[PDB]
Design a binder for this molecule. Structure first.
Ligand SMILES: *[C@@H]1O[C@H](CO)[C@@H](O[C@@H]2O[C@H](CO)[C@@H](O)[C@H](O)[C@H]2NC(C)=O)[C@H](O)[C@H]1NC(C)=O
Ligand SMILES: *[C@@H]1O[C@H](CO)[C@@H](O)[C@H](O)[C@H]1NC(C)=O
Ligand SMILES: *[C@@H]1O[C@H](CO)[C@@H](O)[C@H](O)[C@H]1NC(C)=O
Ligand SMILES: *[C@@H]1O[C@H](CO)[C@@H](O)[C@H](O)[C@H]1NC(C)=O
Lengths: 38, 49, 337, 227, 49, 49, 48, 47
């Protein structure tokens, strides 16, 4: 709760900072989720 | 200590040529830049896992 | 199939076991929407190009054109148009663009100074009479006028300034005539040494060669859209289709996207609308006067999961960043693509 | 033959310019976007000339204008290069219904008022004509104005706020972005202006700003990059 | 960024200038955006290292 | 280095030639100097690692 | 300009004048200057 | 140099003579004679 993530590679549905997807910048989610790192 | 980084993917045929014009035909004569950039980004995404 | 696309991206005939990021899918538009404003009145080009008497070089006129439909194809036969050098804009795509401020100039010069009326170039008529800016957009039109402005005794109503202190700032006029000081003693109304009249007259009789004959010049200085567009071109309108991917053309602003309701609190002086970067995100209808947000088409990354050509030939397709209720189902009509 | 009224001298005092003099530089809607602008703006914490009067004040870059009056006393503006019937002179009046904007080489009284109107005693050639909604509304009633002449346009930015502000030189703080009203395509040279009837006279200069748009697109704050 | 061209948007160049002179300024944006993507990929490779 | 232009002196391009072709001969210098600065920054970033 | 004997108009001389600085400001001490209508470069652009 | 397929179009137009270029419009370009956009040849005029 002290590291604020930006995108985390999740699916996108007043405009947020994630409007870089429309210009071709897509963030991929990691293979190992946090439930597996835990 | 930091362990991993975010994994970004760049679409060349939407960043340079903004997908509303027909300049993608002029991008095919520039060689293989966006093949090795996509390969380097894929290798970075593999190394981050 | 995605297996041969994976083979084409890897430039081999046998792929290995793993995931490969091939090229991406794009929802292509089906229609084309062109929306031009209500106006139908023709631009007053008969009072500018086909006028009886023009002005001088130092006292050129400025005709303001606003809220008109300018057809530039009718200008090619009213005058011979022996030069049509347009700076920044092509002459052929001029009938498909909407302008904001069209300022028409008018003067007549000598035949060997047609090179001087240009951006950057100096001389005697482009340094002391009429300076064009280095970012001048528009066309410089000139035609020969040996049959309409050349008296046998010589026309004397056309003058030019040869003596002036400094170079003129762009788009300025100098109609003040005084004896130019260039010497020690003040002139005080005496045309002596280093005391010359600035407005030297011309001489146009039909005995000179082609190059000293007078040329009627109409300079059309345009100002492209960053405002509500007053002057537009002869393009027919199209009914606005929303909630679908169409090719929109709003007063020259072209693109491809989905036009929906914007729900923005627009103020009545704003027309355009942008995002974090400098791209067009919102737009206003020139006929409905409603605001619409421009959203790009549905797309995403396509990944092909293969077990290798040595084991099987079937693959799995992963649409990155796409919800499963938004997968492209329009594969049934791919002849329309 | 003119209606001259001799006024006292009263040399003008100076006050401060905390956050006033910020307009909308373009007609492009931006929301939650910090933007930089290199347009002609009013400098933050500068000296405006307080009057309590119609002198011959130059223009020279553009002029910011403000007024705090309960009733409509300050009513018009005159522009031009030399008001001696040799150059064109822009005119703005605020009657009860409309606004008459004319570009002529007028000859008028040196200290004119409206309520007689020795402001249009003679007129020769009407270059432009404009009739529209009134600029003003029909201790309180702060009326701010931004006047500038660049690229063949006379753009007017204005917004009216019902302020409750005390008696001293305390031109109020806070932020209020002035919305554009009109833009007239005139090619007039303006080096001097006059007012018609406590007002303020500002001077613009090219400065770099850092604008701040909210979720509705209203400018809530700005930062001057040279203070 | 215009990178020496007349407009940063790729749509108002081909509808403004003719096929020939449009190219000179489309390449000015293409070689600028490719250089920006190359700088981004190089800095991402250094950060990945 | 002139990077293919007429000279490596900035005011000599303005004094020799004129606006339309002055900017086609000074952007070749500006882009080259920006590329050399980016190369220096990349090499300093490698040396910093 | 300030010579003693001039040549006739059928035996007009041609002296090649070069390799100096050309100061045209010594043309003001004469008679009141009935003719200076030039046909080329302007008189204000002679010193540069 | 050397070529493979040299063609020779024979027509006489008044003027209007500059409308045969690729891009230039008029009553010759889309009605009488069309030059291709990849035209790699000669255009020679007479009197
Ligand atoms: C342009 O023409 C239309 C056609 O009459 C004018 O009125 C619009 O009409 C449509 C359909 O009846 C309405 O949906 C719009 O709301 C109307 N517009 C307005 C502003 O009321 C329209 O006024 C004309 N002018 C402009 C500037 O759009
Ligand atoms: C995807 O669509 C489903 C179906 O409506 C929805 O419930 C969900 O919120 C959407 N987004 C994600 C990230 O699953
Ligand atoms: C404004 O003027 C007053 C006196 O006229 C002076 O004391 C003050 O310092 C000035 N303000 C600025 C910011 O210079
Ligand atoms: C912005 O809009 C919201 C929603 O109507 C409103 O509550 C808020 O007060 C507005 N802010 C300003 C500064 O007008």
């Amino acid at each position: 709760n002290k590291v604020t993530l930006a995108d985390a590679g999740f699916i996108k549905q007043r405009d947020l900072i994630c409007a870089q997807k429309f210009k071709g910048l897509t963030v991929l989610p990691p293979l190992l989720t946090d439930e597996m790192i835990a | 200590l930091p362990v991993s980084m975010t994994k970004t993917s760049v679409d060349c045929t939407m960043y340079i040529c903004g997908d509303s014009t027909e300049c993608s035909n002029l991008l095919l004569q520039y060689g293989s830049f966006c093949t090795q950039l996509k390969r380097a980004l894929t290798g970075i995404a593999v190394e981050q896992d | 199939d995605p297996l041969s696309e994976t083979k084409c991206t890897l430039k081999s005939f046998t792929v290995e076991k793993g995931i490969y990021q091939t090229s991406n899918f794009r929802v292509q538009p089906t229609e084309s929407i062109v929306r031009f404003p209500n106006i139908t009145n023709l631009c007053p080009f008969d009072e500018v190009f086909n006028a009886t008497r023009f002005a001088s070089v130092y006292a050129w006129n400025r005709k303001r054109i606003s809220n008109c439909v300018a057809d530039y194809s009718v200008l090619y036969n009213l005058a011979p148009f022996f030069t049509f050098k347009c700076y920044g804009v092509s002459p052929t795509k001029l009938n498909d663009l909407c302008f904001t401020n069209v300022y028409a100039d008018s003067f007549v010069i000598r035949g060997d100074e047609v090179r001087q009326i240009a951006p950057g170039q100096t001389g005697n008529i482009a340094d002391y009479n009429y300076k064009l800016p280095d970012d001048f957009t528009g066309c410089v039109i000139a035609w020969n006028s040996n049959k309409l402005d050349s008296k046998v005794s010589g026309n004397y109503n056309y003058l030019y300034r040869l003596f002036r202190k400094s170079n003129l700032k762009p788009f300025e006029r100098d109609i003040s005539t005084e004896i130019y000081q260039a010497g020690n003693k003040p002139c005080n109304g005496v045309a002596g040494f280093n005391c010359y009249f600035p407005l030297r007259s011309y001489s146009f009789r039909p005995t000179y060669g082609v190059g000293h004959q007078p040329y009627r010049v109409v300079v059309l200085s345009f100002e492209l859209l960053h405002a509500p567009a007053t002057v537009c071109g002869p393009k027919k309108s199209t009914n606005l289709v929303k909630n679908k991917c169409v090719n929109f053309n709003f007063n020259g602003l072209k693109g491809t996207g989905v036009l929906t309701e914007s729900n923005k609190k627009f103020l009545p002086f704003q027309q355009f609308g942008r995002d974090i970067a400098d791209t067009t995100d919102a737009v206003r209808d020139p006929q409905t006067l409603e605001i619409l947000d421009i959203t790009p088409c549905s797309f995403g990354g396509v990944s092909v999961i293969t077990p290798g050509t040595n084991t099987s030939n079937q693959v799995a397709v992963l649409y990155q960043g796409v919800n499963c209720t938004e997968v492209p189902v329009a594969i049934h009509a791919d002849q329309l693509t | 033959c003119v209606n001259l009224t001799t006024r006292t001298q009263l040399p003008p005092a100076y006050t401060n310019s905390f956050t006033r003099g910020v307009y909308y530089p373009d007609k492009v809607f931006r929301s939650s976007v910090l933007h930089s602008t290199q347009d002609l703006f009013l400098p933050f914490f500068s000296n405006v000339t307080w009057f309590h009067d119609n002198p011959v004040l130059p223009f020279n870059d553009g002029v910011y204008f403000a007024s705090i009056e309960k009733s409509n006393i300050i009513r018009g503006w005159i522009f031009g290069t030399t008001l001696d019937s040799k150059t064109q002179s822009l005119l703005i009046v605020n009657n009860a219904t409309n606004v008459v904007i004319k570009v002529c080489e007028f000859q008028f009284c040196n200290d004119p008022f409206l309520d007689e109107f020795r402001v249009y005693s003679s007129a020769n050639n009407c270059t432009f004509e404009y009739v529209s909604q009134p600029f003003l509304m029909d201790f309180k009633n702060l009326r701010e104005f931004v006047f500038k002449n660049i690229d063949g346009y006379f753009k007017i930015y204005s917004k009216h706020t019902p302020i409750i502000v005390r008696e001293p030189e305390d031109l109020p703080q806070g932020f209020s972005a002035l919305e554009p009203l009109v833009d007239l395509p005139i090619g007039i040279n303006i080096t001097r202006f006059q007012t018609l009837l406590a007002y303020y006279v500002g001077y613009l200069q090219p400065r770099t700003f850092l604008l701040k748009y909210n979720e509705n697109g209203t400018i809530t704050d700005a930062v001057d990059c040279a203070l | 960024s215009k990178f020496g061209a007349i407009s940063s948007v790729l749509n108002d160049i081909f509808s403004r200038l003719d096929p020939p002179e449009a190219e000179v300024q489309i390449d000015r944006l293409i070689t600028g955006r490719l250089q920006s993507l190359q700088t981004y990929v190089t800095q991402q490779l250094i950060r990945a290292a």
